[PDB]
Structure 1
């Protein structure tokens, strides 16, 4: 059915429908699909779903000139820990990704691979099963008590990465990015948000290190920036973006409660602009808004009102993608896109609306999403959400 207490507003008269160039890609509108883990990848091998993934992405690429960022993809086995999330390290995996990229391109849309490394959000028992470490920035602070317990129970205690192990991850990021581009992707997004490994280094709660990778703003940012620099050199700055969530609390990050948090993220933005002025401007910075500090919470919950991401705009002068509860708030989007370098990511409602861009343009009702099938091993709630046309044929305007 359609979202009941929603008054759509047509956005076709705004900058949301003005073209913009991101990296090498000529976008025809500024509604972006942010990365959305769907847990349909197949085990063993973290293989993109051979049955349904091409169809899922094809459906959501249907509006020409759409930028799609893939679900997080693990750069290596050690970077993983979820059996049903895909990887980008193996030939088996890349074969399936190539089919996905080809399908998206056939619809005249674009695809950026999000490179994911879980750190303390990984399941320690899956990792132990495969002979892998349970990794994070530190070893004396844990995501929650349950994760700490699972780690100890599996004889896989949380491990504070050595400098050599950090370098090994960087090598893996480089190879994963190369794999992605070679298979046909338009670029990659470095995931440094949402409380995953790079975010665990950025955040002073999760990073209690006393070496060069902790203990100061510059040190906490080091790993993220090293990855940025490694990828820029490997595949080019025009093929690289960075995702950050300054106010996020998901996966036990500090958010606005940490008084030093804006400084931490301002420093990263500054270092990116510095590289930009040196002729290596990243394709974009992607920010999760304080509108959504935890994406497991229903829209309107977990909104932090005490901070804004606007500071980034004073520092970074390139494109900014903003994500977080925008689908139900066209009135907010209308104001945000008045800034001529701002794009809008729509997550949960792109899950439920394959033709979301058309609906945004014309102010059409939105399909409700089904949270119960966000992560189920099923075509249901993955590839069977209807377009507006199909919804009308199903009688949803009367349901």
Structure 2
């Protein structure tokens, strides 16, 4: 069915429908698919779904010139810990990714691989089964009681990374980025948001380190910036973006309750702009809005009203993708895209509307999403959401 109470607005008369170049890619509009984990990858080996993933991405690439950021993809076994999320370290994975990237390109769209590392959000028992550590910035603060208890039961207590282990992750980011580009991706997004490993280093709640990787703004940002620099060196700044969620609380991040949080993220933005002014400007910065501090709460819930991401624009002068509860709020998008370097990521409603871009241009009803199939080993709720035309044929204009 269509979302019942929604009053759509046609956005074709806004900058959402003006072309923009991101990295090497000439986008034809500014509605971006943000990274969306869907848990269709198969075990063993974290293999992108051999039956459905091509079709899923093909559907969502249908509007020419769309920027797609993939679901988070683990850079190595040690970076993972969910059996049904894909990786980008093995030949068998890249065989499937190549098919996905080809299909998106055949639709005249673009694809950026999000490089993911879980840290304390991983399942310690899966990691123990596979002979892997349970990693984070620190060893004396935990995501929650259940995770801490699972780690102890698995004889896999949370481990504070050594400097050498940080260097090994960086080597894996580099190789994962190389693999992604070689398989045909247009670029990569470094996931430093949503309370995963890099964010665990950025945040003073999760990072109690007293070495050069914690204990100050510069030190907490060090790992993220080392990954940035390593990937810029390996594959070029034009093929690299960075995702941040300054006000996020998901995965036990601090959000606005931490009075130093804006300074922490302003420092990162400044360091990116410094690199840009020195000739190495990242393709984009992707921000999760305080509109959505936890993406598993219904739209309108978990909204933080005490802060804005606008500060980033005073600092970083390149493209900015903003995501969080924009599908239901065309009135907000209309204002945000008056800024000529702003793109809008649409997450949950791209799950349910493969033709979302047409719907945004034309002010059409939106298909309701089914949260129960966000993570599910099924084609259902993955590749069977209808286009607007198909929904009309199903009678949804009368459901």
Question: Could you state the TM-score of these two structures normalised by the residue count of structure 1?
Answer: 1.00
Shift of 1:388: 0.2
SS at the partner of 1:233? helix
SS at the partner of 1:78? helix
Once the two structures are superposed, residues 142-196 of structure 1 have per-residue CA deviations (whole angstroms, 9 ceiling, x without a partner) of 0000000000000000000000000000000000000000000000000000000
Q: Distance in 2 between matches of 1:239 and 1:250?
A: 28
Shift of 1:215: 0.2
Shift of 1:69: 0.0
Q: Distance in 1 between matches of 2:157 and 2:338?
A: 49
Q: Distance in 2 between matches of 1:77 and 1:378?
A: 24
Match of residue 197 from structure 1: 197
Shift of 1:342: 0.1
Once the two structures are superposed, residues 72-121 of structure 1 have per-residue CA deviations (whole angstroms, 9 ceiling, x without a partner) of 00000000000000000000000000000000000000000000000000
Q: Distance in 2 between matches of 1:7 and 1:73?
A: 35
Q: Distance in 1 between matches of 2:85 and 2:356?
A: 24
Q: Distance in 1 between matches of 2:373 and 2:35?
A: 16
SS at the partner of 2:291? coil
Shift of 1:297: 0.2
Q: Distance in 1 between matches of 2:142 and 2:174?
A: 28
Where do 4+ consecutive residues of structure 1 move more than 2 Å? none
Q: Distance in 2 between matches of 1:3 and 1:388?
A: 13
Q: Distance in 1 between matches of 2:224 and 2:258?
A: 19
Once the two structures are superposed, residues 322-348 of structure 1 have per-residue CA deviations (whole angstroms, 9 ceiling, x without a partner) of 000000000000000000000000000
Match of residue 345 from structure 1: 345
Q: Distance in 1 between matches of 2:296 and 2:356?
A: 21
Shift of 1:295: 0.3
Shift of 1:270: 0.2
- Report whether the alignment pairs 1:228 with 2:228: yes
Question: Could you state the TM-score of these two structures normalised by the residue count of structure 2?
Answer: 1.00
Once the two structures are superposed, residues 243-288 of structure 1 have per-residue CA deviations (whole angstroms, 9 ceiling, x without a partner) of 0000000000000000000000000000000000000000000000
Unmatched segments (≥5 aa) in structure 1: none
Q: Distance in 1 between matches of 2:331 and 2:53?
A: 33
Match of residue 42 from structure 2: 42
Q: Distance in 1 between matches of 2:352 and 2:223?
A: 35
Unmatched segments (≥5 aa) in structure 2: none
Q: Distance in 2 between matches of 1:26 and 1:366?
A: 27
CA RMSD of aligned residues (A): 0.2
Aligned length: 399
Q: Distance in 1 between matches of 2:295 and 2:233?
A: 33
Match of residue 316 from structure 1: 316
Once the two structures are superposed, residues 37-56 of structure 1 have per-residue CA deviations (whole angstroms, 9 ceiling, x without a partner) of 00000000000000000000
Shift of 1:202: 0.1
Shift of 1:132: 0.1
SS at the partner of 1:70? strand
Shift of 1:21: 0.2
